[PDB]
């Protein structure tokens, strides 16, 4: 009976809530009340990178910590050498409304996507000397929101028709599809060992997915509005979520609960990006307040402010060797901080 | 030395500049309609040239880009409103089928009162204007709309009623105006009408830049 199934679902939800409420024997706010505060952290601009003609929506650090890629509404991707402020390649597009970009871990390919429902893969190492399109993946019914690489052969995408998928580049079709959300998905992030990943999807909920089986193992809830950014901790055992009601949160995957909430009484705007530092002590956030804030990750206070922009901060990133933080805003400029 | 790489960058920069002079002269129009709103015939008769479609053309040495959204406008989220750079919004609406009017009419109030579109113009095209001529001498508007206060056989009265109904749902009456027209198969003076309205909007902006207001 449908009523029997619904009652069983209610009983299962009660059991799950009771199990979660059983294990909260303390809190991080009390166990870490004896750590010397970090003190004021001030950073200055080291470079400014000019050359775009419109808003900037994405950026990604290459794996050597020196080259980076960016995508704007002009219809262009640009590859920058960060040490000396040059340009390596300028790639035109077939579609002007773009919303994501990625850099392959080996340094050969890049990816691009947007409102055309198609994900394009470009090849940079060629005999003839130019940059030519290598693959076009189609099969989603909505727009793409984020895309990441696993190797030079497999790619993972998330689309705005409530689904995520894993594509095989050599052949050109789907291998596994993940379904289970109600609204559209906005961001996903990959595990350090490339065995799991997480997604946030405008239901005030986030999910953990396995890549070799195709099933979800855990669903977290707690926010009040949309989720716009997500990232892992360097360990691989915690992740930080950013929402649209001026609030960040830190969740754990083994206790299956929520650990910290970062919020302040002077902040009444949304969040556009979240990233971590190498040792796991700093958390960075970009706001619509035209600035970036720097939080301590174990005390929940404020450490500092980076305030060099005159418009919304849309993109944020930290290197793999931990030397610089890069920001991109709707004023058509990127900046590097150290 | 291999400082010659720097020269490479300079060449790239030059090409970007040769696009900038063009980008500032482009005018964008966002087109919205319906299944029976005559979008296909309207596009076909202007001699122009699966997701978002674009059309690029020119009128009297000014470049126009028209963006067509093919039914995806059911997306109701903020991040799909990334069209904050357009200069006008163009509705096509069918005035023959009375029953559907409320449906089409409903859509208006959702797309016009949004906040990203506070400083853009609206152009309205009521279509066919001959099935009305046929029906008005046959069928009564009062069976569907009860507020028609005139004589439901005169075309002028009913047309005034329709345009008033559409105007009534735009709040914030005066930032930039709402225009209206009637057309069946003119296919020839449409460019002139769109051009006049865009030029009027540009004047509205210039009189604010110069502080002469």
């Amino acid at each position, epitope marked *: 009976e449908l009523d029997q199934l619904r009652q069983e679902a209610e009983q299962l939800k009660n059991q799950i809530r009771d199990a979660r409420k059983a294990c909260a024997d303390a809190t991080l706010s009390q166990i870490t009340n004896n750590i010397d505060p970090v003190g004021r952290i001030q950073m200055r601009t080291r470079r400014t990178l000019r050359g775009h003609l419109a808003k900037i929506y994405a950026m990604h650090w290459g794996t050597d910590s020196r080259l980076l890629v960016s995508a704007s509404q002009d219809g262009k991707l640009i590859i920058w*050498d960060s040490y000396t402020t040059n340009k390596v390649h300028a790639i035109p597009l077939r579609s002007s409304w773009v919303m994501t970009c990625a850099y392959a871990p080996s340094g050969n390919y890049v990816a691009c996507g947007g409102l055309d429902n198609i994900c394009s893969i470009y090849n940079l190492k060629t005999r*003839e*000397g130019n940059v030519r399109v290598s693959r076009e993946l189609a099969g989603h019914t909505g727009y793409l929101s984020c895309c990441r690489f696993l190797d030079d052969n497999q790619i993972v995408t998330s689309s705005g028709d409530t689904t995520c998928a894993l594509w095989d580049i050599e052949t050109g079709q789907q291998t596994t599809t993940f379904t289970g959300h109600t609204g559209d998905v906005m961001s996903l992030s990959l595990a350090p060992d490339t065995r799991l990943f997480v997604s946030g999807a405008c239901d005030a909920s986030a999910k953990l997915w396995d890549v070799r089986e195709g099933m979800c193992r855990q669903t977290f809830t707690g926010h009040e509005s949309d989720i716009n950014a997500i990232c892992f901790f360097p360990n691989g055992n915690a992740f930080a979520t950013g929402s649209d009601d001026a609030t960040c949160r830190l969740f754990d995957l083994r206790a299956d609960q929520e650990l910290m909430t970062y919020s302040h009484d002077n902040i009444i705007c949304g969040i556009t990006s979240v990233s971590f530092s190498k040792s796991g002590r700093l958390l960075l956030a970009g706001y619509d307040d035209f600035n970036c804030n720097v939080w301590d990750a174990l005390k929940a206070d404020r450490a500092g402010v980076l305030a060099g922009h005159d418009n919304r901060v849309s993109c944020l990133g930290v290197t793999d060797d931990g030397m610089a933080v890069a920001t991109g805003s709707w004023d058509s400029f990127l900046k590097i901080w150290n | 030395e*291999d400082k*010659a*790489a720097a*020269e*490479r960058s300079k*060449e790239i920069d030059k090409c970007l500049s040769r696009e900038k002079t063009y980008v500032k002269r482009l005018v964008k129009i966002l087109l919205l309609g319906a299944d029976n709103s005559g979008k296909s015939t309207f596009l076909k008769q202007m001699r122009i040239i699966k997701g978002i479609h674009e059309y690029d053309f020119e009128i009297k040495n000014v470049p126009f880009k028209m963006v067509d959204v093919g039914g995806q406008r059911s997306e109701r989220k903020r991040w799909f409103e990334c069209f904050d750079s357009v200069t006008s919004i163009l509705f096509l609406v069918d005035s023959s089928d009375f029953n559907r009017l409320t449906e089409s009419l409903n859509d208006f109030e959702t797309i016009v009162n949004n906040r990203v579109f506070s400083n853009v113009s609206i152009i309205l095209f009521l279509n066919k204007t001959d099935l009305l001529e046929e029906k008005v001498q046959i069928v009564s508007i009062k069976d569907y709309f009860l507020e028609f206060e005139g004589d439901p056989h005169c075309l002028r009265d009913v047309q005034k009623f329709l345009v008033e109904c559409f105007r009534n749902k735009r709040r914030d009456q005066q930032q930039k105006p709402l225009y209206h027209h009637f057309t069946t198969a003119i296919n020839t003076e449409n460019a002139r009408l769109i051009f006049r309205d865009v030029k009027d909007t540009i004047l509205h902006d210039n009189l604010k830049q110069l502080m002469l207001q």
Partner: single-chain antibody, 232 residues
Framework: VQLVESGGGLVQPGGSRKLSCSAS????????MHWVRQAPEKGLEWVAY????????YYADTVKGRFTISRDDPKNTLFLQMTSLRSEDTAMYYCVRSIYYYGSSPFDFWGQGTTLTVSSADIVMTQATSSVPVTPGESVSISCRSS???????????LYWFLQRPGQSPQLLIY???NLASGVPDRFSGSGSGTAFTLTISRLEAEDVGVYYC?????????FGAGTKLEL
């Protein structure tokens, strides 16, 4: 990729000539070009350099003011015009491709060259030996020496290694002292330090016989070495 040159032949003293090179199979407008020369039975020497956008032009000492270089992009042709030739110009000429961006591979394709007959702050390089007898199946090591340190402040070292089989144009083996070029079997290696350089071949085979060359690219003019020949 394919480059074919033409315009050579025989001339009497005085007079003047012109050489052309035609390109196919790549983006000619994005590359720089070099003209390289070889004596009848001796080492290599460098003649001219023309760059992208036709902005920078470099000539050598025994050339300057007497030779001219030019390019035409839409027809994809490269020209060298020569005036008042002498006896020491009898030689065979090669055309070479180049590019410069972070991570690139300069000197990655060579033409097939033409024959022409006529009736100091420079950095010097020294090749150790003129010949080395070798045995199939055994490893070999060669070395050359320089007159300055090639380790610039930015961590690079600019030394190059080329190979020439009997009867064809040379092809690149090693660039920037530690890197392999595309198409080279994974048994060649190189190493060294400021002012000493060595190259190593493990497990010799057939078709590995020829003459080996080591190049510098720290500042113009570029200088070559005498060459080592392995006799199989």
């Amino acid at each position: 990729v394919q480059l074919v040159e033409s315009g050579g032949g025989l001339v009497q003293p005085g007079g003047s000539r012109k050489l052309s090179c035609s390109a196919s199979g790549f983006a000619f407008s994005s590359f720089g070009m070099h003209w390289v020369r070889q004596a009848p039975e001796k080492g290599l020497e460098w003649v001219a350099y023309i760059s992208s956008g036709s902005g920078t032009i470099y000539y050598a000492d025994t050339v300057k003011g007497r030779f001219t270089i030019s390019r035409d992009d839409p027809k994809n042709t490269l020209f060298l015009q020569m005036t008042s030739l002498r006896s020491e110009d009898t030689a065979m000429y090669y055309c070479v491709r180049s590019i410069y961006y972070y991570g690139s591979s300069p000197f990655d394709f060579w033409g097939q060259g033409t024959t022409l007959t006529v009736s100091s702050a420079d950095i010097v390089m020294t090749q150790a030996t003129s010949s080395v007898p070798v045995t199939p199946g055994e490893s070999v090591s060669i070395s050359c020496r320089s007159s300055k340190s090639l380790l610039h402040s930015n961590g690079n070292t600019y030394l190059y290694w080329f190979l020439q089989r009997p009867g064809q144009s040379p092809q690149l083996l090693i660039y920037r002292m530690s890197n392999l070029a595309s198409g080279v079997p994974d048994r060649f290696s190189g190493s060294g330090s400021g002012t000493a350089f060595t190259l190593t071949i493990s497990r010799l085979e057939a078709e590995d016989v020829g003459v080996y060359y080591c190049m510098q690219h720290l500042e113009y003019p570029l200088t070559f070495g005498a060459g080592t020949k392995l006799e199989l």
